[PDB]
Design a binder for this molecule. Structure first.
Ligand SMILES: NC[C@@H](O)c1ccc(Cl)cc1
Length: 330
């Protein structure tokens, strides 16, 4: 089997991407944030505290003939940005872009933190990291990808995120028309539960490439590119007027600036992030100070190849027995 679904930026900055997901019988379609940095599939629901729901589409398991309460199971998750959610668990039929999983754990939110409430466009998350990170207790549950894997033509999914445009998540096949050149594959460590890999270095604009190992995770659920302070300093030093602002919480730059590109290494191959991708616009409405898309990872404990980096590439998440990551230009 295969599946193919369009993923769409939630706003004009590409802060996140939503992908339609069918849950239950008859189908209830929710727009979920596909997150390769977590492993829970959770949704706003009929059980979510009413004061904490504001515009989202909710899953109502009582209206699904295939929904079954997973007796005694609860979940609770906190994300890197400080947001959180928790609730109980059903199993139900879940389809993504024509690919169907029966008996998928669908985690129903009883509580969500303010940032989820405030974002009307995201109805939940669909986690695509390794199932070892799943938070369901007392019996840990498998991701959608893990459940689908054996049925897929090939045990892979791919992320093809757009810049200020729709993109695609495919399951079970590699679309050879979606990228240019060849895909370069690189080794993955699963020891922390993430798609963790090692970039071979970087360049700033037309600068010379610096060979240096950068350990990081491929995370579709993180907006920006978070890299070591040395690297980030070297990038923003090439932008006149750029500075790290403790009050704003990172690097800002004059909105009148032209940003250089940023290249990262995948083995001997190179992915170029155009400078426009690194512009996240005014720090506040009407400001002439703009927020940078490349930020320091200091105090995270790991580097994060988030959407800024990933949307510059066609990315293969290979879930074979020995997982690997593939990157191609597009
Ligand atoms: N995208 C999931 C989010 O909780 C996350 C996961 C891992 C890191 Cl290092 C940062 C943020």
């Amino acid at each position: 089997s295969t599946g193919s679904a369009t993923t769409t930026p939630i706003d004009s900055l590409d802060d996140a991407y939503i992908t339609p997901v069918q849950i239950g019988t008859p189908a209830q379609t929710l727009n979920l944030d596909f997150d390769t940095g977590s492993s829970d599939l959770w949704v706003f629901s009929s059980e979510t505290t009413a004061s904490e729901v504001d515009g989202q589409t909710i899953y109502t398991p009582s209206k699904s003939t295939t929904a079954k309460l997973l007796s005694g199971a609860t979940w609770s998750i906190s994300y890197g940005d400080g947001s959180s959610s928790s609730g109980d668990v059903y199993t139900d039929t879940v389809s993504v872009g024509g690919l169907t999983v029966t008996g998928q754990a669908v985690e129903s939110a009883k509580k969500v933190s303010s940032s989820f409430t405030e974002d009307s466009t995201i109805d939940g998350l669909l986690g695509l990291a390794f199932s070892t990170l799943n938070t369901v207790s007392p019996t840990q549950q498998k991701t959608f990808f893990d459940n689908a894997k054996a049925s897929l033509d090939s045990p892979v999914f791919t992320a093809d995120l757009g810049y200020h445009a729709p993109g695609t998540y495919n399951f079970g096949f590699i679309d050879t028309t979606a990228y240019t050149g060849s895909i370069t594959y690189t080794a993955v460590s699963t020891k922390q539960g993430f798609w963790e890999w090692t970039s071979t270095g970087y360049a700033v604009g037309s600068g010379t490439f610096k060979s240096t190992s950068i350990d990081g995770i491929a995370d579709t659920g993180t907006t920006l590119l978070y890299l070591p302070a040395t690297v980030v300093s070297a990038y923003w030093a090439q932008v006149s007027g750029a500075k790290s602002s403790s009050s704003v919480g990172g690097y800002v730059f004059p909105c009148s600036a032209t940003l250089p590109s940023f290249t990262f290494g995948v083995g001997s191959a190179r992915i170029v992030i155009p400078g426009d991708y690194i512009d996240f616009g005014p720090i506040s409405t009407g400001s002439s100070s703009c927020f940078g898309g490349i930020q320091s990872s200091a105090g995270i404990g790991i580097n994060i190849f988030g959407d800024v980096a990933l949307k510059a590439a066609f990315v293969v998440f290979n879930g074979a027995t020995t997982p690997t990551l593939g990157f191609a230009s597009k």
